[PDB]
Amino acid sequence: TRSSVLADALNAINNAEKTGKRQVLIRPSSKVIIKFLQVMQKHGYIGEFEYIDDHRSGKIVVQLNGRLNKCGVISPRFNVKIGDIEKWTANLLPARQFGYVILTTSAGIMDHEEARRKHVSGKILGFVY
Amino acid sequence: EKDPKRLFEGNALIRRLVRVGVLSEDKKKLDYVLALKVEDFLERRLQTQVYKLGLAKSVHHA
Amino acid sequence: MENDKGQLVELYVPRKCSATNRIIKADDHASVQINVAKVDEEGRAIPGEYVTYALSGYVRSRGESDDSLNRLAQNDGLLKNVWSYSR
Amino acid sequence: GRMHSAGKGISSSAIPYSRNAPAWFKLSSESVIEQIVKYARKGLTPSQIGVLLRDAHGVTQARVITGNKIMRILKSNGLAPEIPEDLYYLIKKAVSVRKHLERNRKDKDAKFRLILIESRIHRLARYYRTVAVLPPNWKYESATASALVN
Amino acid sequence: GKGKPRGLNSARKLRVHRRNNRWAENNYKKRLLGTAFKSSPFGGSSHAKGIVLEKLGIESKQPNSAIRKCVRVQLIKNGKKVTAFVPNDGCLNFVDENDEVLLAGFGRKGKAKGDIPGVRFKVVKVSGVSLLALWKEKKEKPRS
Amino acid sequence: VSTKMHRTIVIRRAYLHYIPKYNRYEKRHKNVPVHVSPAFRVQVGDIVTVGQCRPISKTVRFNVVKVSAA
RNA sequence: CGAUGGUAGGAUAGUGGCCUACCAUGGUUUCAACGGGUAACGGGGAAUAAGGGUUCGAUUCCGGAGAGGGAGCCUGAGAAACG
RNA sequence: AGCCGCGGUAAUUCCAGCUCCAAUAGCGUAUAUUAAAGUUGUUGCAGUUAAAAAGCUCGUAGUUGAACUUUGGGCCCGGUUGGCCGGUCGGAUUUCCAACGGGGCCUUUCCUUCUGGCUAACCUUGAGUCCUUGUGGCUCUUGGCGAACCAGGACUUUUACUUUGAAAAAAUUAGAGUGUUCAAAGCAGGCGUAUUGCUCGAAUAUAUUAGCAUGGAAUAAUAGAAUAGGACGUUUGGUUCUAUUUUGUUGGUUUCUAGGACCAUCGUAAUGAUUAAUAGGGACGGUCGGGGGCAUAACUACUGCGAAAGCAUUUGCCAAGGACGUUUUCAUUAAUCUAACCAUAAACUAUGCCGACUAGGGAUCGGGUGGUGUUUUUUUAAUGACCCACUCGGCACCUUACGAGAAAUCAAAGU
Structure with a gap:
């Protein structure tokens, strides 16, 4: 039964952008859904979104541009050290100059360039390109 | 870049290839060694540098 | 794409679609491109001016083409009251 | 999706939105x-x-x-009440099939609908014991079927 | 969900299934049970010396047909016996007997639909002298 | 986890262990026997802290120094 | 016929069921105990290698054991020693 | 002649001559192991017809488990980078900008404190000090303090993970310097007057489990007040236990005093209980079915029920069960239920099974809500049947295919 909420909150997106739609409807929301979304929004991959609430756990309605190829989740959230980001990043990402893998790290959820110049590390969460 | 192992082990590898004369003196950048070729060492042997400098009439007279 | 010096070094930049922002390659042989005619104050047509729409290969095959015309055209004032957002 | 079944329906009440009293109270x-x-x-x-x-x-x-x-x-x-209400209703349901069994013996079927009803009681009883609203020696049995409510 | 567990504290099922059905790789089972001693005529060696019982002539039945010359032998470290092969004295003129010989194996696997039949060994030297040194005639068999 | 002797008890400890090829953990445990002074009153299920002394019995090298209940 | 704990002695360079008296009934286990195989001395290390890994380590350094097979002791600061 | 094979004369391979090819000190043959091998699969394989999903449901250990409890706003200092600026007998930058990371305070809001020294610092009775003259600070004197450091504390849920440190022998491995005549090596060497000399080296990296020191508070666990023996009080009554001190000193007594805990009731705080999963269980109301037990064909597909094997005459009993309906209620998720036969049905097989999402089409079976539509008639309102439209649940069927596949084919065998 329903085990991960984020894992099918990103399966609902690219399943309805392979068919070229413009908006999707997510259910339920989460504190870690929104911050995964807020890092695909300061880089341009999605548009804007709204949070319903209905007193249980809200839904979300997202607006998609044209620019996502794939966004995903990595399901045992393993434990990335600090010398081992660049082996995760040479395998998941299509080329060396774009795309991002994001991490839950002791100073917030962030992408993998942003974690380099703050000099932190944590557990993996997903990717986006 | 600006990583102190790149700057100490880079500027020594570059410095050794010029000191024997394989890298060109305007190609002192680290990406330029990745397109080096195999006869750029073959043209520095004594068998080749004595024939070019006018001492033997052929490469088998070297 | 452009080098250290600055010049573009592709072969040649390709055409984005206009309904779904995809990219239309050199073997998308159903990729329609459609012009309409501007109008004159007397009610005639200028022979040289256009408004251009580019539609991809696969918004047509599913059948979602004409609605994507009415959505696209009505933003440019060509029509009025034939398409509606809140369906 | 209905433990101990294979049905998949959904029909509950839907609680209204407002957390206040209506104006017609x-x-x-x-x-x-x-x-x-x-x-x-x-x-x-x-x-x-x-x-x-x-x-x-x-x-x-x-x-x-x-x-x-x-x-x-x-x-x-x-x-x-003493025993929590839902648990008591599975007990009373469990004796009525048990009382049927002293009058019937050629029913291979409803034998194997009682081991299902009894199975939901150990599931309920683990939880009530762990949260400690039942004392940690509460146990159900066929003798305690005809003892505690009966 | 792939039919294998993915979660984080799952390393014990994963490593105990892998050595469980690692016993169908055909030459890992030969190495741990150690069947090289208990069944092989050599015991795990490159070469082996034996002493020749008698000349044999063997033939190859379906599509091929000719006259393959082999030799019986009895190993010194073991006492068991095998049938070797001697290469291309196709002239039929090098029978030799009660001699000391050195065997080896073929790089073995083959096709015996022409029925080049079931031997597994060869001969590399005899009585202290190589075979090719006699065929190319660089030595001759030592005797007094 | 057991208080059935005279002036000794048995402590259970629990950890995890990392297997590098499979990138994951597995659970293990070890029991230790310690000594209990009669100043403390320890029933099963509690959680103690213990410190090390010179060899007391065949198999004993710790005894309790604090206690906190269940 | 000490297996796990308590009390008092004996013995040792010294702690300790190390041994002896009286008493208690314990301790290990599917998170694999106990038993069987090993053509098994352990590690630093070695061969192959995109990444992950597979297979070796009798053998120049450090640690243990042995002197045909078992047991016993003398001299000494130190040996259950094998020139 | 490794394996496809070439022989039945003269062969575009055996046996020899000639001429060519490959490595040059042959890697020629044998036996082990590694890559090739996504043919051991964590990264990373295989579901119908090719090897391969157990007869069927309940249920151990093991693995895995919904959402929620401090966000935001404002001010200010100080980092190096893109920079303007070059000003020049590449380095200053007068000096400003963009970002990128870091402090700091304030907003209903973080160490929780105590006693001592103790040092700087604000200040207290108050001037020294010297500058426009000062309770000015600086600092002198008494006195309030925060303020840096030692020492006693004083109490306070506990982990997992991650960051930086100390400590992981040399040899070997990655590697800096260095004309062994080059090289593999070695740790040497270089310079002058060579005439009694000075002089640079022998680096650096490689937590790689467990333990130790330290920074952070995301992710995922865990504890706390519900019969209040709850928390704060300088409400008041108590019961104890210590004597450090002073009655020089000593020992012999008890008076306070401080100093430990426990003992009633008297006061103030807004006194203290997360939602109600298109998760699960439990009631509740009208129904439906060849479901089961006791007693007494046709309808059978177009489709009905059951965990499976299976299940057909009416009548009545006994209990069970799905779905629907609802502004009821509780706060849940894994030890392996005549007989016996011989296989004489291509004897269709890599389906915790639960969960989310992704195109159409019409028929039928249950339950519910609608409607100026019908008609038995009570009447063209309604009971009543029909009819129409929606709706949640069922076994099936026909289309296409973006997709998937070795293909046949498939709304999952797709993502």
């Missing part, structure tokens, strides 16, 4: 909190109370008109 919390205890002395469950309260005196939810739930009100006034 003209009573007090004190003039309604005592009808709960006025029917507890009649020996009723919470389950029969609320459906009787809703269909007759128009209280949509005691949860919102008074500050508490039903069982919290009943526990504060000492009218609370």
